[PDB]
Amino acid sequence: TRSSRAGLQFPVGRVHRLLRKGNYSERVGAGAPVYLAAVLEYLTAEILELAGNAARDNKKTRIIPRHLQLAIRNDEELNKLLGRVTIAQGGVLPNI
Amino acid sequence: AKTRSSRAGLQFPVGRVHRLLRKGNYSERVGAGAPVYLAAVLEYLTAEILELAGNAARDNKKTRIIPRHLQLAIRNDEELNKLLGRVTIAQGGVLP
Amino acid sequence: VALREIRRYQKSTELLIRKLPFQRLVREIAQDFKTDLRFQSSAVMALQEACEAYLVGLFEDTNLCAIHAKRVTIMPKDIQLARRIRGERA
Amino acid sequence: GTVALREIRRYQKSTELLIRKLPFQRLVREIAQDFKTDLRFQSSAVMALQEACEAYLVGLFEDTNLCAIHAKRVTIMPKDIQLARRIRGER
Amino acid sequence: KYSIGLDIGTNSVGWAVITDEYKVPSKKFKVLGNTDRHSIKKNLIGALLFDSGETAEATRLKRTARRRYTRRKNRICYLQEIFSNEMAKVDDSFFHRLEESFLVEEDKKHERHPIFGNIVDEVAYHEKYPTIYHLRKKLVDSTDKADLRLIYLALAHMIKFRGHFLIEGDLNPDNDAILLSDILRVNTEITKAPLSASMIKRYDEHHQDLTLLKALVRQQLPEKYKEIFFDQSKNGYAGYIDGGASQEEFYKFIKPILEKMDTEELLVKLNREDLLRKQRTFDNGSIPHQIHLGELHAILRRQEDFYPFLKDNREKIEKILTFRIPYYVGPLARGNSRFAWMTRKSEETITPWNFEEVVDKGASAQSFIERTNFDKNLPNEKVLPKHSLLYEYFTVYNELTKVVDLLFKTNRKVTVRFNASLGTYHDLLEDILEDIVLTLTLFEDREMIEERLKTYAHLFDDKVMKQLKRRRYTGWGRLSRKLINTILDFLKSDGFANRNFMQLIHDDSLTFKEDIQKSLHEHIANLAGSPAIKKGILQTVKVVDELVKVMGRHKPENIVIEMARRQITKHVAQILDSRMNTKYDENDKLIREVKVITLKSKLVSDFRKDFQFYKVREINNYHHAHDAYLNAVVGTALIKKYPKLESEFFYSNIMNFFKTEVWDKGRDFATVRKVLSMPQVNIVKKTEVQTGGFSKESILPKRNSDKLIARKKDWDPKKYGGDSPTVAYSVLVVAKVEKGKSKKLKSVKELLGITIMERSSFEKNPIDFLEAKGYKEVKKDLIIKLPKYSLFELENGRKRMLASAGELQKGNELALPSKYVNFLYLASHEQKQLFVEQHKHYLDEIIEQISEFSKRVILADANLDKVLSAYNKHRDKPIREQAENIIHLFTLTNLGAPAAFKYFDTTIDRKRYTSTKEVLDATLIHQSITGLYETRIDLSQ
Amino acid sequence: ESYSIYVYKVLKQVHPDTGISSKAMGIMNSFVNDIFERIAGEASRLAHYNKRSTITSREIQTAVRLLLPGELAKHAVSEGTKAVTKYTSA
Amino acid sequence: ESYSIYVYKVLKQVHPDTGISSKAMGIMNSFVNDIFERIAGEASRLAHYNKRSTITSREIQTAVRLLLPGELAKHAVSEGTKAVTKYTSA
Amino acid sequence: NIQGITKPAIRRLARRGGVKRISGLIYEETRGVLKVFLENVIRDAVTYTEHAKRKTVTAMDVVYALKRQGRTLYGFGG
Amino acid sequence: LRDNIQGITKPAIRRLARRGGVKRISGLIYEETRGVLKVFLENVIRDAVTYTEHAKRKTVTAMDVVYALKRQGRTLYGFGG
RNA sequence: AUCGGACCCUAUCGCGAGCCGUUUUAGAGCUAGAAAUAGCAAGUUAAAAUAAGGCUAGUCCGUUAUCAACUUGAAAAAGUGGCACCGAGUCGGUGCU
DNA sequence: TCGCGATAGGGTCCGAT
DNA sequence: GACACGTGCCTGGAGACTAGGGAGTAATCCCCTTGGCGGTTAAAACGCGGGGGACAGCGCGTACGTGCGTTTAAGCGGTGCTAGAGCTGTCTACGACCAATTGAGCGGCCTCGGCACCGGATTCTCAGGCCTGGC
DNA sequence: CCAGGCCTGAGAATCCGGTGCCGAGGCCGCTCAATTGGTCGTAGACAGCTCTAGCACCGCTTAAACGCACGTACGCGCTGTCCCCCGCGTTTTAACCGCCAAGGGGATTACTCCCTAGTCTCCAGGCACGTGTCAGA
C-alpha cells in the first residue's frame, strides 16, 4: 500500500484524497501528501510523547484531555503553536 | 448593453470578479448571480468609504483624495473600524 | 480558602457553570435571532465549553492588571481595560 | 506640557516617518543577511516595513498608555509594554 | 613562574597559587564521569577543611577502663575457683543462678532467687540483712558457723569494690588515726570493722529520717507528699530512689519543702547533707583498701575454724584482694600486645600468686623506662640520667666556659649567678658511680633497687645501702657517656682559650666531629605534638604534593606557611623542605629552588587594616582561604623587596614603604581586590569513615522498637533494654526489595547506614550482610561505599554534604563582595560614621543579597519570613547593632549543620535535612583530596 | 490587475467634486483585494461545510452578514438584493 | 473519518505503557484536522502567490517552516525529507 | 435570563482564573462581556444554521463560527 | 553593522512615543521598545525571507512582505495582496 | 633562627588504681477497687555487663592515627584528568589538541 | 576521679653555630 | 510633476450552444430533541462580622522634561554598473483520468476490566524537642 | 557545640484494600475507499536573454542627534484613613437526574431539472502611455 510504500503509519491515501477534494490546489505532486503525512506524524508524535510522560507523572496510564492541555501549554513551542486553541475539558495551566 | 454590470446597473466588472474567483479555485462550479452579488458588496463598501473620504477631504481642505484620507475616514467610523482594526494603511498617520 | 479553591479548580477539568440554566440562556438568546431552532445537547455543551474558555482567557488578564496597577485583586475597570487592550471590545 | 502638546499636534498632523531611513535600511539588511546572505532588497518593501513597524509601535505605545492610565501613572514603565504584549499575546 | 602560599589552621588549610605578577592562575581541569560538562576552569586558590583531629585521650581512658574491668572479673573468678571446693557441697546451681541473675525468669534456667532459690529464705535474709553490710557485720562480730553462700557473698562484695591503694602498707584505724575522722563516725572498739558499722549507721539515719519525713509531709502538706513521692520525674524522694536523680538536685528540690513546712532536725541534717543517702556514694571512693583487708582477715579468723579450705586458702584470698599490678610493669600480655613490655620468666598463665616468680619485675621496669627518648645527636645511644655525675661535670664546664674545685666540689650551689650544682655528689660522700646513678633513676621499687644494688653491696656499709634506698633520682639528661667522652678533659683544661662544648661539637680538628658525621607517615607520626596538628600537617603535605602534581613536577618559586597561635611551624617547614627539595648539587647541598617563607600574622593583620581587608570569621569559610593569597602575596612582596628579609627600628617599621601616604601601588592592590571579588574558592571538606564509640555510652530501658541494638547477643533489646549508634560510611544499596503486601521486587538504589559495629561484618562478607537486610540481586561492583562528608550539588549550585544515611549538611558558601565586608567592619567599629550613613543603603543591599541567597539555596520559608519581619520591625534600630545582628545572621546558610541563632532576641531553630531523596538524583561527586580533580556521576544507572 | 477605472467611476458618481491620488488608488485596490479574499475564502469554506460545491449568491450574503457589523451588513444585503434583482430582470 | 487507530499505533510507537481516553482521542483528531487544514491552506496560498498551479513537496516544506516554529520542525522536515527519500525509496 | 449564570458560577470561573477577591460589580460586568460574546457567537452560529436550512444547531457549526471569530477549541467532533 | 536598533536614534523613538501620546518617556522604555521592535523585526524578516527563498528568487519583493505580514496577522495596504 | 643547663609554667603520651552512674533481674507490697479507684506500706541493697565481641585465648586486644576512584597491589607506593591568553557571582570565553 | 613514669613545649635567664 | 483625458489596439468579457450532474424537491422513517414530571439535593442565596483591602495626601528623591550647547551622518544628489527579475520558448515528468482490484477499515456490538472511589491506615518526615559518661 | 537518632508530637503526605461500573477493546459482518496498471498533455523546469532597478559610492549640508545642566514636577513609600467583599452560618431553589411521548425535522433516497462548465465566436472596454494643466510645498 502507498503508506506501506512509505512505510509510515499515517494514512497517505486519505491525506491525498483530503488535499484533492479540499481543492486547496488544482494539482498536487505525488510526494506532497506523503510529506504532509510525515510532518503530521512528527507533530502528533511530539504531542503523544508529552501526553504520555505527563500521564506517567500523573500516576494514570490512561490519557484524559487534561494531559494534552498540560503538555501542550507547558511546552513553549507548542504553546506558541496552539496559542489560539482551547483543548476541551482542558482546564487552566497550573500557573500561580 | 454588453457589460452585464451595466445591464444590472453595476459599476464593478462581473466578468473580472468571476474570473478572479475561478482562478481562486474556491470550487469547480460557481453560480452566475454570485459574482453579481459580490460586485454589489464591493461597490457599496467602496462607495461608503469613498464618500467618507471625500467628506473628510472637504474637512481637510483638499479636493483630491490623499492616501491618508482613507485612514482618517476608517478611524472615524467605528463600524468599519471593527472590520479593519488590524489593517495598517500606508502613510495612514496616527489615529487623530 | 481562596488559594485552596484556586488549586482545586485549576487542577479540575470539569466545567464550572451548570448545564441546564446555560442551555435555557442559549435558547433565549437564540429566540432573539430566530424562533424555532433546536440545540443538540452536544452543541449546548460546545457553546458552554467555549464560553468557559473565553471567560478564563479574560480572567488571566484580569489578574494581570493588578500587579502593574500595584493593585490587589480585581475591579471592573481592569476587565474593561483588558478588553480594550485586546481590542475585541468595540 | 506647553511644547509637549504642540509636539503631539505636529506628530498627529503629519504622515512623515519618525525614523530616519538609513538606521532602518541597514538594520533590515543586516537582519536579513543573518538568516541567509546573497539576498537583495526591494527599497519600497523597506518603506513598507518601515511604516508597518512604526504603526506596530504606535499600537503598542497606546496600549502602554492605557495601562499607565489605569495605574494612575503618567509615566509609563517597560513592565507596562510587556504586560500589554502578554495580554496582546505577542511573543 | 609561580609561588604557593599556605595558611594552616586547626580545621582549615588554605592554599593559593600566584604568579610573578601577584596573579592567581586559573586552570582548566577535565571532569570525568557521565555528566554533561567534561572540563571546567577554576582558580588555583582554595582551602582543605577537615574534622579536627580527635585526641587519643578518650581512647586511652576507655582502654584503661577495659583493662580494669577484665582484671576485676579475673579476681572474682579467682575467688570463685577458690570457693567452688565446698560450694559443690553447698550445691553448684548457686553460682549458675548468680550468672543467670541478670536474665529474666522467662529465660532464666533456674529460680529467680539467687541466694536460696526460694521466697521464704530470701525474704528472711533481706529482712534480717537489708544490705550486704548487715551480713558483713554479723560475720565480723559473731563466731558462729555461717552458710557458705553468705561468706561467699561477703567476700565477693568486699573484693569487687576493694577500694584504693593510695597509702602503702596496712593500718588499723581507731577513731596517724587522722585519716578516717569524717566518715566512720562510729566507735571502732565494738568491732574491728568500723566500715560496716558506719554504713549501718547511715542506713539507720536514712530509715528514721524517711519515717519522720513521711509522717511530717502527711501531716503538714499531704498533697505535696503524694505529688512528690508518687512520681519520680519530679526528682524528689521517689526520683532519688528510682529515677536518675542526683542527690544534690534532690536536696535542691527538698529545701523549699523543708522551709515551707514547719522539721528543724531534717533541715539541719540536710544542710549537713547527710540526712538521706544512697549507701553507695560518689565520694566514698576515698575509702582505703586496707580496712577491707583487715575486716576480711577478721572474718576469716571468725569463720576459718569451721571450713578447712578457707583456712587453707587464706593467704590466697589475702593476696588476691591485696595484690595490685605494679605501675611500672604495665600490661600483663604474653608478648602479644603492642603496648606490652613485660618479661615473664615462666610461660604459665599469670595468677595473683605466680607473678612474683613468673614476672621479672626489674627487667620489665627497665624496658618500660627505656621505652623516654635516646640521645638526640645519635639516636642509638641512650640518654644519661639527669643527675649523672659526668652530666654534672658537663653542665658545670658548659657554664664555666667563660671562666671550682673548692666551691663546686664541696658546696651544693655556687653563687657569684650560675645554675649548676654538685649537691648530689656531696650527699654521696666513676663507672660504678654512674651505674649507681642509673640504678637509682631507672628503678623505683625499693626491693627491686635492693636487688639491683646487691651486686656491689659488698662495698661500704649496709647503712649506706639504706641511704641509697632512701633517695631516688628522676628524669633524664640529653646525651650518652660515649658522646660526652676527650671532650671533658679539654673542658677541664683547654690552655689559654677555654672552648665551649658546642664549639668542640663543631670543631673539625678532632676526630669527635668525624664521629659526629655518622616514611612520611611513619615519621610524621613519630613527631611530638597533638594528633590534631599532626593530621593537619599530613594533610597540608599531601596538598602540596598534589599542587606539584597539578604543575606536572614544575617546582614553585616560593612556599609560604602560616599558622596561628613556633617550633611546630618550623617542623612543617623542614618537612616540606626535606620532601620537596629532592635534588642535591655536586656539593651535597640542598637547593631551595622553591624559597621557604615563615610569616607573622600580626603583619598581615596590619596590612589588612591599612588596606581595608578586615577578615571576619563569621563570614563563610571563603575568607580564611583568601588569607592564603595574602599569606603568599605579602610574603612574596616582602622577599623580593629585601633579600635580607628572606634570609631572615627598621624591622619595627617594615611597613613604611607599604603606604603611599617588587611592589606596585596600583597593580598589586587591584589584583588583591579582584581576588577578594572572585566568588569561587576551592573550599574542600575532607571525606572519610567515622571512627569512634559504637553508640552513645548510655543505656536505655526496654521498649518495643527496632531502634535498639542489644547490649548482648542473647539479651533481647526490647526486653533487656540496651544502643543509639553512630553511623560510619553508608552503602549505596542498588537492588530489588519487597514492596507492598505482594512484596514485589522493585528496584531501590538508596542509602543504607552502616555503623562501625556493622563495618567488620560487612567487610567480611558484603553479600551476606546485604541479603540479611532483605536485599536481592546483590550487584557487587555497584556496591558503593559512601564515606561521611562527601559533597553533592543541586541545580542552583545548592549543595548537600553527606553526613548521615538519612541526614544532610549545608555545603554552599555565599561569597560576599569585599565592599560589603569593609562596610560591615566599619559598622562594627569619624570617617566611619559618615561611611555608614552613606552605605546604610549598602547594608540594605547586603541583607537583600543574603535573603535572596537563602531563598535560592536553603529553601527555608518560615525562619526567613521571621527574620525578615524582625528586620523590618528593627530597621530603625542603630546601624551598628543591626550590623552585629546580621553578623549573627551570617550563619543561617553557612557550611555544615544548620544552627539556631537570635536575630536580636528571637531565636531561629536549625532547619535539619532529614531526607536523602534529593541526593539520590543529584550528581555524586568523588573528589581528589585537594579538590582540584573532580569525578561526578549521577546515581541513576 | 487593478480595480482602478471602476474606482474612478464610483468616486465620480459618489464625489464628482473630488480627485484621487495614485497612492490612494493603490490603497483602494489593496483594500478591495483584502475584502474580496476574505469574502471568497469564507464563502468557499461555508460551501464545503455545506458539502455542496456550487457557489450560490446566498453563500455570499451569509458570509457578508458574518463579516460586516449588523447595520452595515443589512445595507450590503439590500444592495446585493437590488443587484441580483436587476440582473435577473436583465 | 477518524484517525483513532493511527494515533493509537503511533502512541504505542512512542509510549507503549500508556492509555488514552475517548475524549483525548477526539481532541487529538480535531487537532490533526486543524493543523492539516492550516498547513494545507498555507501551501495553497503559496502555490497561488508564486503562480504555482501544482502543490509539490518543496512549497509545502516552505509552508512547514513558515507555520511550524519548531526547532525540530526542520527535523520534522528531515522526517518528511526522510519520508521523501523513503517515498523516493518506493 | 442571563442570571442562569448565577454569581457563584461567575465566582467559580474567576477562581479558576486565579482571581483573589471578586467585587460585586465584577459579576454583572462579566455577565455583560460574556453576554456580548455569546451574542456574536450564536449569531454567527444561527447564520450558518440558516444557510444549512436545518433548524437544529450542530456542534460542528459552532466550531466553525468559533474558528471564524479567530478563537478555536478542539475536540467537539472538529 | 552593530547595534543599529540602538542606532535607531532615541529621539526617533521619542517621536514614536509622543505620537503614541505618552506623557513621560524614559530611557528604560527606550531600550525596552528597542528590544520589542528587534523581536518583531526578527519575526517578520524570518517569515519574509522564508517566502523569498520559496519564490525561487534572490531579491526580495514587496509583495513577499505583504504575504508575510498577512501571515503574522497584520495585513498591509498600498501594494495589493 | 639554633644549643646545653637552670628556674617557673603547660600540654601530650603511656601505665597502674579506684567510685559513681546507667539497664535488666532478685528485695513476696498490702488491702479494699474483680477493673480503672484510692489510701496505706515499704523505698538504702544485691548479682552481671559497662562498647557487639575477635583470636593471637593473653589476668590480650577491639573508639589514636591513615582513608576520593581505578589499575599496578597484600601492603607499601606509583600513575591515572593539558598548555597559553582574555574576563569573573561560585566560574565564563578563544586557539593547538 | 587518685597515683606513677616518660616526652614535648612556652618564657626568662647563664654560657655559643 | 501628478492626474485626468485623449488614443489606439487586443484579449478578456460577453452572447449563444450544449450536455450534465449538483442541487432542489418531495417522500419516508426514526431519532434526538423538547417538554413535562417527579423526586431528590447540593448548590444558591441572604445575611454578618471582620479583616484585609482600598484609598488619598504629603513629602521626598529622583528621573525625565526642558533648555542650551555641541556633533554628526541622513538626505540629496550626483554617478555608473550589473544582478537577477522577469519574459519568452522548448522539453518533458507527472498527475489526473480511466478502469480494475482488493480487502481493509468502520460502526455496531457486548463484555470485562481498568481505573475510580474511597475510608482507613501508613509511611516517613520533619522541624523542632531531646539528649547525648563522668567523679 | 553539635549534630545524629529517634522520637515525639503531629501530622504531611502516601498508599492502598476493597469494591464497582462504564468505556476499552475486541469480534461481527460488510464495501467503499485505498491501491495499482496504463495513457496524455500538461505545469513547470529550465535555459536564453535582457534589461531594468538594486547595488555601489561617497560627500556637502545641517537639522536632527548627542550630551549635559538644571528644575520641576512625577513615582511611590509611608502613613493615615475608611469599608467593602470573603468566609461562613443558615435557609431556599431550582440543579440534578431518570423516564417516556413525539414528532419535526434530520437523514436518506429516488425524481427531476435547470444552471453552470466547457466550447465557439463575437468585439469592444480597458490596457498603458502621452499630454496639458493645475494643485501643491
Tab-separated table of N, CA and C (backbone and C1' of nucleotides) in Angstrom, chain J residues 65-83:
chain	number	residue	atom	x	y	z
J	65	A	P	42.208	10.225	65.301
J	65	A	O5'	43.505	9.889	64.443
J	65	A	C5'	44.708	10.619	64.627
J	65	A	C4'	45.874	9.920	63.981
J	65	A	C3'	45.768	9.706	62.481
J	65	A	O3'	46.161	10.840	61.736
J	65	A	C1'	46.367	7.681	63.503
J	66	U	P	45.286	11.313	60.479
J	66	U	O5'	45.461	10.135	59.424
J	66	U	C5'	46.738	9.826	58.883
J	66	U	C4'	46.659	8.665	57.927
J	66	U	C3'	45.550	8.746	56.890
J	66	U	O3'	45.899	9.547	55.776
J	66	U	C1'	45.518	6.617	57.902
J	67	C	P	44.818	10.540	55.126
J	67	C	O5'	43.755	9.561	54.465
J	67	C	C5'	44.147	8.626	53.473
J	67	C	C4'	43.024	7.678	53.150
J	67	C	C3'	41.667	8.327	52.928
J	67	C	O3'	41.510	8.843	51.620
J	67	C	C1'	41.428	6.531	54.430
J	68	A	P	40.792	10.262	51.401
J	68	A	O5'	40.956	10.541	49.842
J	68	A	C5'	40.719	9.516	48.891
J	68	A	C4'	39.292	9.531	48.407
J	68	A	C3'	38.909	8.407	47.455
J	68	A	O3'	38.650	7.188	48.147
J	68	A	C1'	38.215	10.458	46.539
J	69	A	P	37.462	6.172	47.754
J	69	A	O5'	37.472	6.094	46.166
J	69	A	C5'	36.276	5.806	45.458
J	69	A	C4'	36.549	5.558	43.999
J	69	A	C3'	37.641	4.547	43.692
J	69	A	O3'	37.194	3.205	43.757
J	69	A	C1'	38.017	6.486	42.428
J	70	C	P	38.256	2.012	43.943
J	70	C	O5'	38.837	1.780	42.479
J	70	C	C5'	37.971	1.617	41.365
J	70	C	C4'	38.740	1.666	40.070
J	70	C	C3'	39.981	0.796	40.034
J	70	C	O3'	39.672	-0.552	39.738
J	70	C	C1'	40.517	2.953	39.237
J	71	U	P	40.484	-1.741	40.445
J	71	U	O5'	41.796	-1.860	39.560
J	71	U	C5'	41.712	-1.947	38.146
J	71	U	C4'	43.055	-1.686	37.526
J	71	U	C3'	44.215	-2.361	38.233
J	71	U	O3'	44.376	-3.710	37.835
J	71	U	C1'	44.735	-0.087	37.867
J	72	U	P	44.945	-4.790	38.875
J	72	U	O5'	46.474	-4.382	39.028
J	72	U	C5'	47.336	-4.376	37.901
J	72	U	C4'	48.688	-3.828	38.264
J	72	U	C3'	49.248	-4.325	39.582
J	72	U	O3'	49.823	-5.613	39.482
J	72	U	C1'	49.505	-1.982	39.455
J	73	G	P	49.162	-6.835	40.286
J	73	G	O5'	49.926	-6.823	41.681
J	73	G	C5'	49.322	-7.355	42.847
J	73	G	C4'	49.579	-6.468	44.036
J	73	G	C3'	48.580	-6.562	45.175
J	73	G	O3'	48.785	-7.673	46.035
J	73	G	C1'	48.920	-4.305	44.662
J	74	A	P	47.789	-8.942	46.029
J	74	A	O5'	46.418	-8.450	46.692
J	74	A	C5'	46.298	-7.217	47.395
J	74	A	C4'	46.717	-7.311	48.841
J	74	A	C3'	47.343	-6.053	49.421
J	74	A	O3'	46.380	-5.084	49.798
J	74	A	C1'	48.606	-7.955	50.064
J	75	A	P	46.548	-3.551	49.343
J	75	A	O5'	46.689	-2.752	50.714
J	75	A	C5'	46.993	-3.428	51.924
J	75	A	C4'	48.370	-3.086	52.433
J	75	A	C3'	49.025	-1.848	51.843
J	75	A	O3'	48.555	-0.648	52.431
J	75	A	C1'	50.593	-3.620	51.931
J	76	A	P	48.568	0.728	51.598
J	76	A	O5'	50.113	1.087	51.449
J	76	A	C5'	50.936	1.319	52.585
J	76	A	C4'	52.394	1.199	52.224
J	76	A	C3'	52.868	2.154	51.140
J	76	A	O3'	53.216	3.424	51.661
J	76	A	C1'	53.523	-0.035	50.579
J	77	A	P	52.311	4.707	51.326
J	77	A	O5'	52.747	5.097	49.848
J	77	A	C5'	54.092	5.445	49.565
J	77	A	C4'	54.531	4.888	48.237
J	77	A	C3'	53.860	5.495	47.019
J	77	A	O3'	54.445	6.726	46.643
J	77	A	C1'	53.845	3.142	46.836
J	78	A	P	53.567	7.847	45.905
J	78	A	O5'	53.617	7.414	44.375
J	78	A	C5'	54.853	7.318	43.683
J	78	A	C4'	54.655	6.683	42.335
J	78	A	C3'	53.557	7.310	41.491
J	78	A	O3'	54.004	8.447	40.774
J	78	A	C1'	53.249	4.977	41.557
J	79	G	P	53.070	9.750	40.667
J	79	G	O5'	52.322	9.578	39.274
J	79	G	C5'	53.004	9.063	38.141
J	79	G	C4'	52.086	8.230	37.287
J	79	G	C3'	50.725	8.836	36.992
J	79	G	O3'	50.750	9.734	35.897
J	79	G	C1'	50.449	6.610	37.719
J	80	U	P	49.866	11.073	35.931
J	80	U	O5'	48.457	10.630	35.332
J	80	U	C5'	48.365	9.617	34.342
J	80	U	C4'	47.066	8.858	34.457
J	80	U	C3'	45.838	9.690	34.789
J	80	U	O3'	45.281	10.324	33.652
J	80	U	C1'	45.888	7.753	36.154
J	81	G	P	46.028	11.571	32.968
J	81	G	O5'	44.850	12.420	32.326
J	81	G	C5'	44.973	13.829	32.208
J	81	G	C4'	43.650	14.515	32.407
J	81	G	C3'	43.698	15.708	33.350
J	81	G	O3'	42.813	16.728	32.902
J	81	G	C1'	42.256	14.040	34.240
J	82	G	P	43.413	17.861	31.945
J	82	G	O5'	44.848	18.116	32.591
J	82	G	C5'	45.482	19.380	32.511
J	82	G	C4'	46.593	19.345	31.497
J	82	G	C3'	47.221	20.686	31.151
J	82	G	O3'	48.236	21.063	32.065
J	82	G	C1'	46.649	19.548	29.163
J	83	C	P	48.376	22.591	32.536
J	83	C	O5'	49.041	23.314	31.284
J	83	C	C5'	50.215	22.795	30.676
J	83	C	C4'	50.503	23.504	29.380
J	83	C	C3'	50.383	25.016	29.439
J	83	C	O3'	51.540	25.631	29.971
J	83	C	C1'	49.225	24.208	27.544
